[PDB]
Amino acid sequence: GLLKEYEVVGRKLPSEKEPQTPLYKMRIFAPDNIVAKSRFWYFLRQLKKFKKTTGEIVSIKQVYETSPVKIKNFGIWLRYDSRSGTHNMYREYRDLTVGGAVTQCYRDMGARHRARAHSIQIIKVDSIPAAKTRRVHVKQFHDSKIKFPLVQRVHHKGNRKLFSFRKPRTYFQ
Amino acid sequence: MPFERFVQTGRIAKASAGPLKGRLVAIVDVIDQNRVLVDGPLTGVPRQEYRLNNLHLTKYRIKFPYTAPTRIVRKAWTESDLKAQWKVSPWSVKAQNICKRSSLNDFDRFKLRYAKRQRNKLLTIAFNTLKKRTKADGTPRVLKKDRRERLRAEKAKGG
Amino acid sequence: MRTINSNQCVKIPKDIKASVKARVVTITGTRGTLKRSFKHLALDMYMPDKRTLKVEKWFGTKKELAAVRTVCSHIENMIKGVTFGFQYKMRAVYAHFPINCVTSENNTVIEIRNFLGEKYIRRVEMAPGVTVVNSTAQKDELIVEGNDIESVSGSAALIQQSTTVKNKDIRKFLDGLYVSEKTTVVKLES
Amino acid sequence: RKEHGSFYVGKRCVYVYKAETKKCVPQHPERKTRVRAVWGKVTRIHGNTGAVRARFNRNLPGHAMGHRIRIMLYPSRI
Amino acid sequence: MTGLTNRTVVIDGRGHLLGRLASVVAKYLLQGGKVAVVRCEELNLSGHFYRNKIKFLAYLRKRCNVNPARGPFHFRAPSRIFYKAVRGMIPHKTKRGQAALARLRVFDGIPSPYDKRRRVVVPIAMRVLTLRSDRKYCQVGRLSHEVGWHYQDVIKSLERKRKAKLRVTLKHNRELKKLTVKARENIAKAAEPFNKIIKSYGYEV
RNA sequence: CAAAUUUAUCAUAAAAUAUAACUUAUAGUUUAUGCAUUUUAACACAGAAUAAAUGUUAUUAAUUUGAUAAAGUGCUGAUAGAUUUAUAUGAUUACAGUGCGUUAAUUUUUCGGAAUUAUAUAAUGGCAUAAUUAUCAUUGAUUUUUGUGUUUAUUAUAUGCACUUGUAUGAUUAACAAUGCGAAAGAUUCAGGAUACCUUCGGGACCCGUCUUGAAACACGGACC
RNA sequence: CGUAAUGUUACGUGCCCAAAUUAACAACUCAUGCAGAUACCAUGAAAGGCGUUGGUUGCUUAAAACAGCAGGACGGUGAUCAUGGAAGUCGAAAUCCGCUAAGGAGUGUGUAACAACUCACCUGCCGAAGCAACUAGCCCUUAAAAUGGAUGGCGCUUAAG
RNA sequence: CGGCUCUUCCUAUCAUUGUGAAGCAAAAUUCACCAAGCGUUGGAUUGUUCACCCAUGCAAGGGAACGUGAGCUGGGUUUA
RNA sequence: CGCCUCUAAGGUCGUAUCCGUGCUGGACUGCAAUGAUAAAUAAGGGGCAAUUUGCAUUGUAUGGCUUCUAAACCAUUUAAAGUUUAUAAUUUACUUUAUAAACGACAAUGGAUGUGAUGCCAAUGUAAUUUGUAACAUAGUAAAUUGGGAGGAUCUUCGAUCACCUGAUGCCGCGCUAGUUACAUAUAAAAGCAUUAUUUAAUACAAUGACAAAGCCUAGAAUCAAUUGUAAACGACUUUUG
């Protein structure tokens, strides 16, 4: 889907020998909240003990990008499983939302490295400014004043007329 | 230059195929090579991204900073006199004739088949006996030069 | 990664009249004129009414923006090839048998014979617009000269690929006509 | 498109064609019953491109494929 | 005079990829079509020339051993290359698709009324919309000259006759409507049925 | 439900760029290639002023943009179907609606009109406590059985008699209208019919018996009656 | 899995063929004799590619490098190793010396042995990124059978992979 | 089973065409590339099939339908 | 990738291969050019018919009448190409060049630009019987006949190929538009107020058809049998027959 972010919090439900277990939290990227509560458990089983059934899910809440029309570069610290292959990457994308950059990373890994998405762990996701990005296909856009003439449109198929009388003509003037 | 569609600020482009189809956005920043950040304050467009497929670029370029908020963009449409310029622009006229031709009530349809028929009768009459191969001569002079005598003489009839 | 813009601007001198139209660069100088159609190439080519000629590319891959300096040196060959011209000079080296090279008026061709004591008379036609001659004041030498560098240099190497020596050791039978100095006609020397 | 093929949804269709012989008279207009017809309704649409689905009284013989069916403008909505 | 929408659609084959036109035609002909494709020497194939030449020469190698006269006949004209593509996208062993193939005329180089008729394009088959700048392409007229079709330069001379007949029928029809533009100032005082009523379409018409 | 970005809003704000003063620079150029004029899509995120310049600081209204949820929410346009021999051996059952109905105020368009308020009983909420029971956390909050008034809201019961083309017809399908008369012997109208075919077309479609894990089998048998 | 009518469903939607050449996108890939095209499944590896795409580590760098046009590279000496033979050099126990802005007892087909020469050093102009090593996407390569031939067929290349 | 006859196909290339490379001077050869168009024989011994022998030959490659018995032959094998 | 480099575009040399030519067959039976065109002369065949008729049916045309687009985008080039017009220079040719504007793949254009500027209509009757009768400013248009040149042929809907067309000869000298404004005249109501019904055709335009229907023109071949022997199993084949 489109992969919005959440904060899933978990406990280890306190048998009376232990009062008030220490409450870890996350930043999970997921299509929906039913799948964010098995990405919490997948990532925490690497880190602390307490699986489910022996833990609780305290509040999972969605976080709503704090500037949806400001324009910023997102660096994603990733690690994935290739065919021979656990690696780390640091990818950079350019977007407005932070769930929209993570989802622009889950396609790119599928395109470029064949990476079906169960292999990708996300470490960190930031909003790095500029003159901290490196990633030359993102530094293309870090200059006012940028021009680029367009060549891009739609060319309906068949059309509102399949057998046209007047030739689309990719160019004019 | 040949100068194709410049993606700038603030090159006014009219949207073309999306949910904003028909409205005139400005362009304030370029997200990536495929998407810009469109914002038309005087035309019912809040600031939002847009895919550059569904945009068609006009010839107007207003001036604001590349990181401006919507009030600076709205201030610059007015100073350019862009609304008065756009509706008299060479083929925004052409937009509204297709909008006029669009879907065209049944009385207006069959009124034009009547009104084009009558000037078409007036236009096949103003047609096609030029200098070519008359004068001289056109024999017999009485009858195959009967009708054009009223173009020539004009009075009255050969005669 | 589909670079946005790659461009190169060719300075054109005071006399010759370059005029790119629809991509086809024609150019016209003292020693004649030359048109080359670059329309295999999907590139900008416009002359911004200065002396200069600009060539641009929008969103080309990594290969596609190698052809910017290619075409901006094909035009820079043309501003020589109509002003200074080209003149190659291949020098006809032999061991025992002399090399006989006959051209006449105006007989653009060549007949190149006695190689290597062989009866067969190699005859090869120069391209349109290029004249071959025997070099006066330095004999046993040819002078291939014309306007277009791809029709001069294809006309030298047509007669360098024949004469060629077969079934022998080609490190020992160093015989043939090999290009000494690829040069321009009028500036400075020849 | 879908919006275009749904105008015709509800309306009455006909496959009209020719035979020769009656087993009838000029009771009504003056016929050898020398033109047949098989009526039907458009029931719904088919793809995303304005095709449609029809349900005739008899069944449409199949050598009718390619031939003209007529979308009567009634049962008339707006 | 007639056709199931108009007389026949005459598609100019100039600038159109062969298989993206052969499928919209084969679909249209199974719906009741009547098309004609003219200039079949000008259709395109994607990829460079030798890549397609290879594909055709391998097609020429298929032939029945116990009789080559039974075998796959390898028609070499650019129109009967296009008919080969359309015949594969038709069921041609049913009567439905064999009648669908009978509504198909294909021509190397535009004769006999389809030269004064009306040429429509199919903008989804058109090469300049689909392929890329720096992909390579060929024509079927070059492919057919290199494989055994003898009339490449018959139909180049035949066509510039036809393209010089059109040089004067565009010289007449450009001066013959210097008078229709003349006549539309002598009927300016019509009554007023142009002056207002065709401000329904109405700034240009 | 966060979002104080959207929007406008204050505060010293200091920036990650546009607007008014301009040196050079290629310039088909001007005159004597400087300038003159362009190019700014060489213009120095250079000089002066101004432009939230990023959020920093502020609070918010189109309830606070979207998403999720709920309310016969409501409306519109369709499609297909409609057992039913209400006794060839058990009520057309009950519900509900419409027609004459003491009044008196208060309004309403002003028409046979229409609305409201006024009657007891029984509840139920909202509110104000006083109990009580029992629990996340306990400054309090939630909760069970109550009580009584304070109260302000909402439902229910109090519609009998006669009549009628208003639901379940106790798997409801029932109406208006068009066409067509089952002629004394015999026409016609409408619908239907692989009767054994023939015509036409699209889909399907291997040859049966058999033994076999597996048969259309290049397994065996079978030319036909 | 009774016999029917209607509606809704994993495999698919360029044409065969019902349904997208999707007013839905981001990439990847050019395959000259099978580019590639859906599980099982109708084979293909090891090892490579300054083919292109992404990524990881380390150096040089806005002390002016990288590249290139412009300099030297001989020698304190055939120390020895050594006679195809080592005079700047097969091998090589061994190993210590020029000069400054700046020159190698120096790797070599074998230049019989010598010479030179030039990929270091460093003065340049250049004045901006350069250098390698490594990784795994696709394509290529590796990749050879006999009737004519099979992504099912056509045909596809800002795809119809 | 072989041989005889006759046709087609493969390339894992012997030769020839066009080439690249050698420790390629010429001659002769070797290695490799594109490449299946034409060619790849006569005998002695054995039923053979490979290998060997005489010889010619510029040069004497390897295989496919277990190719081929209502095509033959019947030597091998294999009934009495 | 400042140099270098056969490669990335783009050029090139080039095999006993490949594909053609030449050669051999020919969709059985494909196609094109061409020749003659009957049993005649009493009488009837055969065209030329489209004019020839009533007649009857056909197709389009469905209650005028739910149409044409046989007028158009150029040839080759092309994803910064690719476009127009204008003007001053120029063509064998919107020849090529120089300035200046215009939408610099808008909505546009995907249909109508109706691309010789379309029609379900002129007729002021627009349709299952219908037709139309005068004045004031515009407008000047389609019209039938016999002896010369320039032009038109891509596996065909009529080739003693021929449609703008030299100067000649005479007419119906007929029918005519558009507009304001006036008048006569005539047809039209299908019976149903859930007017949908056989869902059609008197309409017009093109086409055959048979029974009595007017003329113009026409006057053959093939095969068998016999023969040959350039051929041959038999057919077939090459031949010959006042």
From Swiss-Prot, chain A:
Asked whether the UniProt record includes Nucleotidyltransferase among its keywords, one would answer: no
Any idea which UniProt keywords this protein has?
Ribonucleoprotein, Ribosomal protein
GO: which molecular function terms?
structural constituent of ribosome
Query: What are the GO cellular component annotations?
Result: cytosolic large ribosomal subunit; cytosolic ribosome
Alphabetical list of Gene3D superfamilies matching this protein: 3.10.20.10
Any one biological process term the GO annotation gives: cytoplasmic translation
* UniProt similarity note: Belongs to the eukaryotic ribosomal protein eL20 family.
> What is this protein's record name?
Large ribosomal subunit protein eL20
What organism does the record attribute this protein to? Answer: Drosophila melanogaster (Fruit fly)
Swiss-Prot record, chain B:
This protein's UniProt keywords? Ribonucleoprotein, Ribosomal protein
Q: Where is this region: Disordered?
A: 135-159
GO CC, any one term: cytosolic ribosome
The record's GO molecular-function terms, alphabetically, read:
RNA binding; structural constituent of ribosome
Is Aminoacyl-tRNA synthetase among this UniProt entry's keywords? no
**What is any one GO biological process for this UniProt entry?**
cytoplasmic translation
- Give the highest taxon in the source lineage: Eukaryota
* Matching InterPro entries: Rib_uL2_dom2 (IPR014722), Ribosomal_eL14 (IPR039660), Ribosomal_eL14_dom (IPR002784), Translation_prot_SH3-like_sf (IPR008991)
Q: Where is the composition biased (Basic and acidic residues)?
A: 146-157
- State the CDD domains in the record: eL14
Assigned protein family = Belongs to the eukaryotic ribosomal protein eL14 family.
State what protein this is by name: Large ribosomal subunit protein eL14
Swiss-Prot record, chain C:
Q: Which GO terms describe its biological process?
A: cytoplasmic translation
Question: Can you name one GO molecular function term for this protein?
Answer: rRNA binding
InterPro entries linked to this entry: Ribosomal_uL6-like (IPR000702), Ribosomal_uL6-like_a/b-dom_sf (IPR036789), Ribosomal_uL6_a/b-dom (IPR020040), Ribosomal_uL6_CS2 (IPR002359)
Q: Which Pfam families match?
A: Ribosomal_L6
Keyword field: Ribonucleoprotein, Ribosomal protein
Family in the record: Belongs to the universal ribosomal protein uL6 family.
The name of this protein is: Large ribosomal subunit protein uL6
Q: Which gene encodes it?
A: RpL9
Swiss-Prot record, chain E:
Give coiled-coil spans as residue ranges.
none
Q: Which UniProt keywords apply?
A: Ribonucleoprotein, Ribosomal protein
Q: Which InterPro entries match?
A: Ribosomal_uL13, Ribosomal_uL13_CS, Ribosomal_uL13_euk/arc, Ribosomal_uL13_sf
Q: Which domain of life is it from?
A: Eukaryota
Cellular component aspect of the GO annotation: cytosolic large ribosomal subunit; cytosolic ribosome; ribosome
Single annotated GO MF: structural constituent of ribosome
A GO term (biological process) for this protein? cytoplasmic translation
Q: Which HAMAP family match?
A: Ribosomal_uL13
Regarding protein family, the annotation reads: Belongs to the universal ribosomal protein uL13 family.
Name the chain's protein.
Answer: Large ribosomal subunit protein uL13
